[PDB]
Amino acid sequence: KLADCSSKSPEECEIFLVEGDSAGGSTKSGRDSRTQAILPLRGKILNVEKARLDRILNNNEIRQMITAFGTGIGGDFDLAKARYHKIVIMTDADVDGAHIRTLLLTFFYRFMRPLIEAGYVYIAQPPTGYKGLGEMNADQLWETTMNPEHRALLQVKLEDAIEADQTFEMLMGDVVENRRQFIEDNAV
Template sequence: MLDSGSLPGKLADCQAKDPAKAELFLVEGDSAGGSAKQGRDKAFQAILPLRGKILNVEKARLAKMMQNNEIATIITALGAGIHDDFNAAKLRYHKVIIMCDADTDGNHITTLILTFFFRYMRELIDRGHLYLAQPPLYLVHKGKVKKYAFSEAEKEAHLKELPDGGVQRYKGLGEMNPDQLWDTTMAPATRVLKQVTIEDAIEAEQVFSVLMGEQVEPRREFIQDNAHLALNLDV
């Protein structure tokens, strides 16, 4: 096992000793976290379930942030410190994968996590260690044939291939059994990962600075200017 010290109790660690071969999944919710723990390859994949929305670091002072259980758990699991004390050489995993539901709440949680990393572990992003998992939105099935769809267009294409096929809409990661989660979102051979760039993080941080910061007027102007984009915004 990796040198653990006092690792968080809910972290299901991997067996890999080389950080370059180790992955950490930050998973939204205990239900999906349980499925991920069952479906993973424990040789190189570690799972850390996160409960609910993590602290909004845009509004919190450092001392308060360090008292937040979910934030503290992430920092401890990664093992590299934060901010000026961040040391990439101590990083326990070279792939950190945010795995949240493909819905408004999931997007909100992803943005909170991105903002935290941008503010306090920016080097993690600069070095290309941060990724977003891309879970499917639909399962199209007919008989024994199953096809996963990651967009509306892909769903329609599968329905043309499988006329009269059934469609299952995944409302959350917790609705997938461990095998489905592995096949669609975790298996290196079949999954889709988006590497987070510093531009992605800056955009997330800027949006959150406006939407979650202390200044009311910029927030009102942003929502008015982007009302067409914010119909499903849940902040």
């Protein structure tokens, strides 16, 4: 499912994570295939905060991401074996985009924290009002979102590791009451 770039120099390579083959195809047309790889996922990914480790390692989407990055996970994680120095989360401009974004960030923070620390995790910002990236044309998707000359990536910065541990456990954890409390407190 990975459409890899020609360059084997990680320092100048970047991988784009997209919601499906819908966005996958539009992206593969738009991209600079010299330095820009594409891994299309298959919708909602496993919530690793709730799931047991057996299920996580057997998950096909989790496996493809580990293989693509080539860093391994947890203790065996090796930042120098990284195959891209920019992992770009490019989810649609909608609410289910925001959910797949929180689910991926939960995976990166629990299994590849040093990737976030190194500043290798970024968040693309497609212009709002198209349905998703499966609804954009490749010419326009390149110029706004993927072209290093005009694009606006957000670099994910981890400031407080204690506050981060509490936030992932509250939003993505199995305890419903803390999550519900957070929503009521922060509603509107």
